[PDB]
Design a protein around this ligand. Structure first.
Ligand SMILES: *[C@@H]1O[C@H](CO)[C@@H](O[C@@H]2O[C@H](CO)[C@@H](O)[C@H](O)[C@H]2NC(C)=O)[C@H](O)[C@H]1NC(C)=O
Ligand SMILES: *[C@@H]1O[C@H](CO)[C@@H](O[C@@H]2O[C@H](CO)[C@@H](O)[C@H](O)[C@H]2NC(C)=O)[C@H](O)[C@H]1NC(C)=O
Ligand SMILES: *[C@@H]1O[C@H](CO)[C@@H](O[C@@H]2O[C@H](CO)[C@@H](O)[C@H](O)[C@H]2NC(C)=O)[C@H](O)[C@H]1NC(C)=O
Ligand SMILES: *[C@@H]1O[C@H](CO)[C@@H](O[C@@H]2O[C@H](CO)[C@@H](O)[C@H](O)[C@H]2NC(C)=O)[C@H](O)[C@H]1NC(C)=O
Ligand SMILES: *[C@@H]1O[C@H](CO)[C@@H](O[C@@H]2O[C@H](CO)[C@@H](O)[C@H](O)[C@H]2NC(C)=O)[C@H](O)[C@H]1NC(C)=O
Ligand SMILES: *[C@@H]1O[C@H](CO)[C@@H](O)[C@H](O)[C@H]1NC(C)=O
Ligand SMILES: *[C@@H]1O[C@H](CO)[C@@H](O)[C@H](O)[C@H]1NC(C)=O
Ligand SMILES: *[C@@H]1O[C@H](CO)[C@@H](O)[C@H](O)[C@H]1NC(C)=O
Ligand SMILES: *[C@@H]1O[C@H](CO)[C@@H](O)[C@H](O)[C@H]1NC(C)=O
Ligand SMILES: *[C@@H]1O[C@H](CO)[C@@H](O)[C@H](O)[C@H]1NC(C)=O
Ligand SMILES: *[C@@H]1O[C@H](CO)[C@@H](O)[C@H](O)[C@H]1NC(C)=O
Ligand SMILES: *[C@@H]1O[C@H](CO)[C@@H](O)[C@H](O)[C@H]1NC(C)=O
Ligand SMILES: *[C@@H]1O[C@H](CO)[C@@H](O)[C@H](O)[C@H]1NC(C)=O
Lengths: 98, 50, 369, 98, 277, 123, 49, 49, 50
């Protein structure tokens, strides 16, 4: 049955997909300008001087920190769900197996 | 046409829709839930716990 | 110490702390610019016998030259100079692509209109500069060149138009402007006007009425092959080392290697999924180079409490240890599935886990400990 | 690395936000630790590692598909080996060299 | 200038643009990636007006069409009949306009206060003696005053021979007039068709970016005529329409998902506004 | 309207403005009424867009036929992209592009409110 | 609709943040799906009516 | 645009922040509801069946 | 608090500022990009001219 129907293990495949997509998302999100003239720090620095350059750099720093906070919050929420599953599994080990 | 016509109501549901906030229906309707509940009772009453 | 700073403490408890990443520094810099030997035509643009009327301004293409602006220092004096793209102090480190010089003569009070967001006779009917503008506007007084005692009337401007101009448009037509209901079929009567008027430039005019020569240098940066570069000297190209670099004004840090990428003839730079340059075409030899970041990572520290000892072991997650990109060999190197662990003894006695490392391996401080 | 990408000017500007970066990693560390705890709560309930006896009869009951297969490089049962070949992971080792 | 006659009256044809009209939106190399971008593009499966030149029902279409802020132009040819375009507003010497032509020796681009002909055309005369096809007439305009832009390409010799058989050359262009620049993208694809546009996908590459500074609201296509010993000697009726076709679509702001293959070639695309799927 | 721009549908209003009030606003401080500058009539402004659209898709590796659900359309101009000649009204919206059958089945692609869809046979 | 309100200029500026909007809806979709799963876990335990 | 885009971006960032706040709260609430639903499902099996 | 002082041509006054280039900004008097202070200037044609 397990051999025949791959969807049986979708519950485990889902946690390796979700926690992979999360990092691919963080890398892809680096392309956003976040209101800046460019997403690349090097373009900002090669064309602008500090009185202006620091504004453009700060727009990107704030935006990248926001992306990281979003990631961490989602991982904390997911972790709580996994813990609940793990606690259930531990309970079953004691009550169904032992 | 209902949100456009009844402006005076200041219906919060229309205010939510016009700002892109959408409420979706459940898959199981109240009638279907009632059928499941009734099936469980019929089972409990005529073939209890088997 | 890195752990101590992270934790804001002079004491670190027993366990594993992450400590940034393994990084290397660049040792030298590479500067690559195309080997353009000609100086830009500063003389023709700024030392011209005659300038165009503002209603019919000139647009000259500039290419295949070095923008050495210093040649103007012992000659020209400008009252106005403003860049809307690049801060002036960085112009010499950059290369430019579609470079054009627009030029014309206007009254001094109208100089303020050659800018994004402005209105007035020039901004609306003769020369509109776009809100989105990269370039520099430069201007100077020409009262001793463009003025005549009886008046220099060779300079015209458009006074009447039906609608405003869009950026960089010209209109040199001479149709009669209809102000009223009259058809104006070559009438030029009460409600009909010839659209252009001359500026009466005279040597005795007050400053706001003196002529000014205006040059607008439009340009685009870092997204196409360079045709015009500032006066920077190039260096040799160093491969397979961590270096700093400047390729046609684009700077960064990384390791340059030969690439198998093929660029279309018009493509100068390539980018990754995060829109970061990851390949360049070299300016003198048209070779494509890939750029890989110098740093990489995977470092953590195994610490007995600091209230016991200051000996630590360091784990390098991405090092196989069979230069290893480590801080020190340590003479005690144990390769595990979790990384290369340097500074710990490997013993064959299994035990209960104390400080977990990963992949089945734990560590502890034990005995002469 | 995520925010500045080794740009020096960014790294210095980012110092003012260092307390936020520290907080992000405290949260991630907490998750990472819980993941090993979950594994132990489920599988390390019994600290006596009991050996499967040489097979003796169990009265006709055949447990060979759940017991570890001694011929394999990794002592997984036939069913476990199947489960391991169905869930697909993002990588195949934790060492990736520069 | 010559006013042409002896043409029949037919309705315009229309066709399906399918997936044509994509061009490289940048000058940056990327590969093995999908990229979402917004620009003026021909919408997918749009209504394309089909114009045609054929001797037979003699037809020779050279109408003035609106530019509408961006034009997709394509043609199918066997014998170099489509030569160029006129872009401008009134096209009557009052304002400046852009003339882009291939006159079989040089590619010529001019911006002047041109007075254009009511029926602008170029043409080739066939000499049965020594079997030659030669460039002869050039009409297009009666005057060209106050020229501000001029370019002439290096000399070349174009093949002016008439041809039998199917169309062999598909040429596609995208014309834009933005912030004073007339931008042209193009591609040349070998074909073998009897009629209409082929289905398929190919992205156009940038060709030129012209610093013109003029207002374009309308444009006109310039076709060559063929004349020979077999036609009347009258200049308005003494001509052959040959065989060629062209298609005109219009660009609209759109978002596309573009697919770049391993070598950075755009191989596919999704028109994000085509439908819900 | 006197320099204030926007997009919307203008209709007659029952609002009365005090003599000194030119514009009115909603709970999100967005103009929702104006007094016309030449005729002093109060007009209400309703946004043009409204919503409720989703797509029911068989995998694209099978077919390109899709059905579209319009949550806020009753279908009895319907503010739909196409009539589709196959219009089924459900409690979850007007479903266009799907056949309605009387055979109940196990749920495949859920739509909502008791209705599911599937791709079945000439499918 | 929430952010731009059909302003065209905003809609174009918002393109740079499109990856964030996609992420917000993936999260909401996940919640919406779980709500039907919860209903079935509680009431559809017996498939014999 | 040179100024308008700054003011528009301030609003775009602010509206995205409001939406992220909403989604985070809904995810937290959803987790609490799931726990309640799991309890209800357990009771259905153990108290009713 | 320090007061720097000198005489320049009027067209060069625009160079006494952060971020500028030109003969003065590059070779005679460079004012830093990070600057706190005030730049004040006036015409002295009736004092410094002969
Ligand atoms: C570009 O050319 C068009 C066509 O001549 C100009 O639009 C016309 O403007 C007049 C005056 O307002 C109107 O009476 C016409 O009806 C308009 N015609 C069309 C087709 O729209 C347009 O203003 C010109 N562009 C610029 C910047 O001057
Ligand atoms: C480190 O690199 C080696 C190759 O240099 C990897 O492969 C093993 O190398 C040892 C050398 O003593 C051989 O005895 C093994 O047979 C090789 N294994 C295989 C599968 O070929 C080694 O796996 C790498 N280490 C890590 C942790 O990845
Ligand atoms: C449990 O059942 C398996 C079959 O599923 C038995 O293994 C087979 O043994 C015969 C010899 O008697 C071989 O010919 C087959 O090829 C084996 N099958 C497989 C899949 O390996 C196994 O011996 C039984 N064990 C017990 C204790 O009864
Ligand atoms: C195509 O156009 C070009 C450009 O107008 C023609 O070349 C010019 O011919 C005149 C007359 O002989 C010369 O005075 C010019 O110097 C030529 N210009 C250049 C750039 O060489 C050319 O003859 C035309 N060819 C055809 C077949 O019509
Ligand atoms: C769609 O609109 C109709 C009214 O036009 C709503 O009311 C029902 O209309 C049908 C018409 O065939 C009548 O047979 C029913 O008796 C009407 N119902 C009631 C309660 O009066 C209909 O409810 C609307 N549809 C939805 C999904 O809201
Ligand atoms: C302009 O001409 C003067 C001579 O009248 C010369 O000294 C000066 O160097 C020239 N300027 C440039 C930029 O060539
Ligand atoms: C000059 O440029 C050419 C072409 O890009 C290049 O081949 C050559 O090596 C460069 N350097 C010298 C000294 O000629
Ligand atoms: C062509 O006909 C038009 C009228 O439709 C006329 O104005 C024009 O002058 C004619 N041109 C020639 C060359 O006869
Ligand atoms: C537009 O295309 C459709 C086919 O999709 C056709 O029926 C219609 O006649 C065409 N109309 C015009 C004006 O092109
Ligand atoms: C062919 O002969 C004609 C005269 O009938 C002459 O005008 C033409 O130039 C000749 N062609 C060639 C290639 O010599
Ligand atoms: C346009 O041409 C006329 C001659 O017809 C000439 O007098 C006028 O100066 C020209 N205008 C421009 C801008 O060259
Ligand atoms: C990419 O280029 C290589 C080398 O020319 C070629 O072998 C390969 O087939 C090309 N791939 C595609 C998709 O064009
Ligand atoms: C002028 O304004 C008055 C008062 O607002 C209005 O009633 C009238 O219709 C307007 N138009 C004309 C043409 O008088």
């Amino acid at each position: 049955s397990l051999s025949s129907t791959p969807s049986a293990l979708g519950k485990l495949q889902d946690v390796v997909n979700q926690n992979a997509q999360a990092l691919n998302t963080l890398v892809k999100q680096l392309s956003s300008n976040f209101g800046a003239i460019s997403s690349v720090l090097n373009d900002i620095l090669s064309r602008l001087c500090p009185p202006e350059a620091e504004v453009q750099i700060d727009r990107l720093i704030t935006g990248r920190l926001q992306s990281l906070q979003t990631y961490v919050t989602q991982q904390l929420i997911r972790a709580a769900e996994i813990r609940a599953s793990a606690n259930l599994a531990a309970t079953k080990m004691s009550e169904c197996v032992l | 046409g209902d949100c456009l016509g009844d402006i005076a109501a200041r219906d919060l549901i229309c205010a939510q829709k016009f700002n892109g906030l959408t409420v979706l229906p459940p898959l199981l309707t109240d009638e279907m839930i009632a059928q499941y509940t009734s099936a469980l009772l019929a089972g409990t009453i005529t073939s209890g716990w088997t | 110490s890195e752990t101590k700073c992270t934790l804001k403490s002079f004491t670190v408890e027993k366990g594993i702390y992450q400590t940034s990443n393994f990084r290397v520094q660049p040792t030298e810099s590479i500067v690559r610019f195309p080997n353009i030997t000609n100086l830009c035509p500063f003389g023709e643009v700024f030392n011209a016998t005659r300038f165009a009327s503002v209603y019919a301004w000139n647009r000259k293409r500039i290419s295949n030259c070095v923008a050495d602006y210093s040649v103007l220092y012992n000659s020209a004096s400008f009252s106005t100079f403003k860049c809307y793209g690049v801060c002036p102090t960085k112009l010499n480190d950059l290369c430019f692509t579609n470079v054009y010089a627009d030029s014309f003569v206007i009254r001094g009070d109208e100089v303020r209109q050659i800018a994004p967001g402005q209105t007035g006779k020039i901004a609306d009917y003769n020369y509109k500069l776009p809100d989105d503008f990269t370039g520099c506007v430069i201007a100077w007084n020409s009262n001793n060149l463009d003025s005549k005692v009886g008046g220099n009337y060779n300079y015209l401007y458009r006074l009447f138009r039906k609608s405003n101009l869009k950026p960089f448009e010209r209109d040199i037509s001479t149709e009669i402007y209809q102000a009223g209901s009259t058809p104006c079929n070559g009438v030029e009567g009460f409600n009909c006007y010839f659209p252009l008027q001359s500026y009466g430039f005279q040597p005795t005019n007050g400053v706001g009425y003196q002529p000014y020569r205006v040059v607008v240098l439009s340009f685009e940066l870092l997204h196409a092959p360079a045709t015009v570069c500032g006066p920077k000297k190039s260096t040799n190209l160093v491969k397979n080392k961590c270096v700093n670099f400047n390729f046609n004004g684009l700077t960064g840090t990384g390791v340059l290697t030969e690439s198998n990428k093929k660029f279309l003839p018009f493509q100068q730079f390539g980018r990754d999924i995060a829109d970061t340059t990851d390949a360049v075409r070299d300016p003198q030899t048209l070779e494509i180079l890939d750029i890989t970041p110098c740093s990489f990572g995977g470092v953590s520290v195994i610490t007995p409490g600091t209230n016991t000892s200051n000996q630590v072991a360091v784990l390098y997650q991405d090092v196989n240890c069979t230069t290893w990109r480590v801080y020190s060999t340590g003479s005690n190197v144990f390769q595990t599935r979790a990384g290369c662990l340097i500074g710990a003894e490997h013993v064959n006695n299994s035990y209960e886990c104390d400080i977990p490392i990963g992949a089945g391996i734990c560590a502890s401080y034990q005995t002469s400990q | 690395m995520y925010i500045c990408g080794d740009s020096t000017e960014c790294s210095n500007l980012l110092l003012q936000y260092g307390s936020f970066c520290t907080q992000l990693n405290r949260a991630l560390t907490g998750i990472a630790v819980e993941q090993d705890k979950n594994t132990q709560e489920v599988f390390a309930q019994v600290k006596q590692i009991y050996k499967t006896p040489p097979i003796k009869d169990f009265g006709g009951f055949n447990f060979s598909q759940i017991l570890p297969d001694p011929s394999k490089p990794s002592k997984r049962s036939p069913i476990e080996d199947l489960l391991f070949n169905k869930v697909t992971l993002a990588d195949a080792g934790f060492i990736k060299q520069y | 200038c010559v006013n042409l006659t002896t043409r029949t009256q037919l309705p315009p044809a229309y066709t399906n643009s399918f997936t044509r009209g994509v061009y490289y939106p940048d000058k940056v190399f990327r590969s093995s990636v999908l990229h979402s971008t917004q620009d003026l593009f021909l919408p997918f499966f749009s209504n394309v007006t089909w114009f045609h030149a054929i001797h037979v029902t003699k037809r020779f279409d050279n109408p003035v069409l609106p530019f509408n802020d961006g034009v997709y132009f394509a043609s199918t040819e066997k014998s170099n009949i489509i030569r160029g375009w006129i872009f401008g507003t009134t096209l009557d010497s009052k304002t400046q306009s852009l003339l882009i032509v291939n006159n079989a020796t040089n590619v010529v681009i001019k911006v002047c206060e041109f007075q254009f002909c009511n029926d602008p055309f170029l043409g080739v005369y066939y000499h049965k003696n020594n079997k030659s096809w030669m460039e002869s007439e050039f009409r297009v305009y009666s005057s060209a005053n106050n020229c501000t832009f001029e370019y002439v390409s290096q000399p070349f010799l174009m093949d002016l021979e008439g041809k039998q058989g199917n169309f062999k050359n598909l040429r596609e262009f995208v014309f834009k007039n933005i912030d004073g620049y007339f931008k042209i993208y193009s591609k040349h694809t070998p074909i073998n068709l009897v009629r209409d546009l082929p289905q398929g996908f190919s992205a156009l590459e940038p060709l030129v970016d012209l610093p013109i500074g003029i207002n374009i609201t309308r444009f006109q296509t310039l076709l060559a005529l063929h004349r020979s010993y077999l036609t009347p000697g009258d200049s308005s009726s003494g001509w052959t329409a040959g065989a060629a076709a062209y298609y005109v679509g219009y660009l609209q702001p759109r978002t596309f998902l573009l697919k770049y293959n391993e070598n950075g070639t755009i191989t596919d695309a999704v028109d994000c506004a085509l439908d819900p799927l």
